[PDB]
Amino acid sequence: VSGITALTVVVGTVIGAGIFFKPTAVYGAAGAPGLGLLAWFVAGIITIAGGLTVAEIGTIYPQTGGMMIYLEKVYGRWLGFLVGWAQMVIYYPANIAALAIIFATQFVNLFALSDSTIVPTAILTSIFLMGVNFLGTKYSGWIQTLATILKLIPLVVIIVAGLLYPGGGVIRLVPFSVETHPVLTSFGSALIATLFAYDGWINVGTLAGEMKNPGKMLPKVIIGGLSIVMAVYLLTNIAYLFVLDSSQLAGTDTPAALVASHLFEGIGSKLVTIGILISVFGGINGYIISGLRVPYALATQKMLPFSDWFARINPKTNLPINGGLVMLGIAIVMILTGQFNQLTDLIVFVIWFFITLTFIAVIILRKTQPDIERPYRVPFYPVIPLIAIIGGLYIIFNTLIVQPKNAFIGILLTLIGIPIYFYCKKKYGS
C-alpha cells in the first residue's frame, strides 16, 4: 500500500506540461521522428540513473532542502550557496517565466487571439499566481490537487486516439536520422528539450530523506515510477507522430494542441486543450510553492543581502512572500526578454551543472566517509552514478558549444552571486 502511494508521487511530480509543448524543440532540432523519439528515451534513462544516485545523498542528509545542503556538506558553504542563488535567480524565475509564456501562447491558440497578447497574458498569469500563493495554501493546494488529477486525462485520451489514427503505424516514425539535421549536434539540442519535461525528478532527494527505513522498495519506487513516466512520454510521442510528423510538430509552438484538433473534431479538442492549460497553470502554481522556499532558506543563513526582509514570514499565511516578490520580478524580466525554448534550455543547462556536482558527490562521499550511515545505497554502485554523470557532462558541454549566448547567461547570473556571497558573509544581511 505504502509503495503504491509513493509511486504516485513519483509519477505525479515528474509529469508536467513538457510533453504538451516541448516536441516543437525536440523534432525542430532532430528533424526526424526517430532521433527525437530516442531523446525521450535517453532523458528517461538519464533521470532514472540521476534519481537512484541522488537518493543516496538524500538519505545521508535527511532534509527538505537538498543541493543547498547536499553540496555544502561535500564542497563547502560557497557551493551550497551558489545552488541557492541559481535557484532563486535563474531556475525558479525562468520556470515561472517559460511556463507563463507557453500558457499564454496556448491561451491565444485556443481562444483565437492576437500573437502580441502572449506577453501581457504571461505577466498577468504569473502576477495572479504569485498573489494567489500569498493568500495561502488554501488556494494553491486547491489548484494542485485539481491540476494533478486533470493533467493525466489529456494524455490517456491522446494515447488511445493517437495510436488509433488512421494514417498510423511504424511508417509514421521512419526517418530516424536526417542529414539536414546532423545526429550528434542536433541530439544535444533535442535532449536538453526532452529533459525539461522530466523536470522535477530532482526531488527524489527530499523523498528519500523523508522515508524512514527506505532501502528495500525505495529503489523500486524510483525505477518503477520514472519508467512509467518514460513509457507515457514515448507513447504520447508515437501518438503525435501518428497524426503529425517531424516538420509539422516543429511548425507550431503548441504541438499537442494541433494533435487534439485532429483526434477530436469539435468541442472534444477544447476539453483536451483546456486540460493542457490546467497542466501548465498548475505547473506555474507548483513552482511558486517550491520557489518561495529557496530565498528564505538563504535568508535562514547569512546568504542574502536583505536577510531580515527575505526571512519575514507573514503571520497570517506562514510563507515568505518577500522572497517570491524578487522571484516574480526577475521572471517578468525573463518573460519580456527570452522565449519559451530559450528559457527551457537555460533551466536544463544551469540546474544540470549543479545536479552533476551532486552525483560526483555520492562517489566522493564513498571515499570521504565510508562509515557515515547510509540508509539507502545506490545499486550497481559505480556504474549508474557514472552514467548519470556521463550524460550530465554531455548536456553541459553540448549546450555551451551549441548555445554560447544562452549558456553565458547561466554562467553570468550564477557567478554574479560570488560578490553577493562575500558581501553578505561579512555584513550578515540587512
Epitope: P62, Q63, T206, G209, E210, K212, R293, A297, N318, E373
Partner: nanobody, 124 residues
Amino acid sequence: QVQLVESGGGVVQAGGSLRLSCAASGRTFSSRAMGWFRQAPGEGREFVATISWSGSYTEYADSVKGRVTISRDNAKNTVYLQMNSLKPGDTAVYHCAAKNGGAASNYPNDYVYWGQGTQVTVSS
C-alpha cells in the same frame, strides 16, 4: 493527533544557559522530524533548529549556530534545545513543531503540529 508541550523557558542572564524540552504525544514521534521555532513580540516565526527522525541530520539558523543544540530522545518522545551563551536577542516564545516524515526542515510551513510555545527572556 500530535499534541506538544514545551518546558524549560524563563528569565535568564545574558551569557547564561537554558534547556528547552518539548514532549509529544508519542505514537508517531519516532517517525517524525521535529523543529524549534521562535517568535519575538514584534515579528512572525523564525527558524531556530530542526532534526531528523533518528537525529542523524540537524540544522540551525545563522543567528543561533554554535550557541544552541537540538537533540531528541525517541524513547521519551521529546525534543530538546540546549541554548548557551544567550543574548538579549534570543528573547522570544520558543515553539516546538512536528511535521510529517523523517526529514528535517527549516521551512515553517512544512510543520503541521505546533506547540503553544514557552517564554524565554534574556537580559542583563
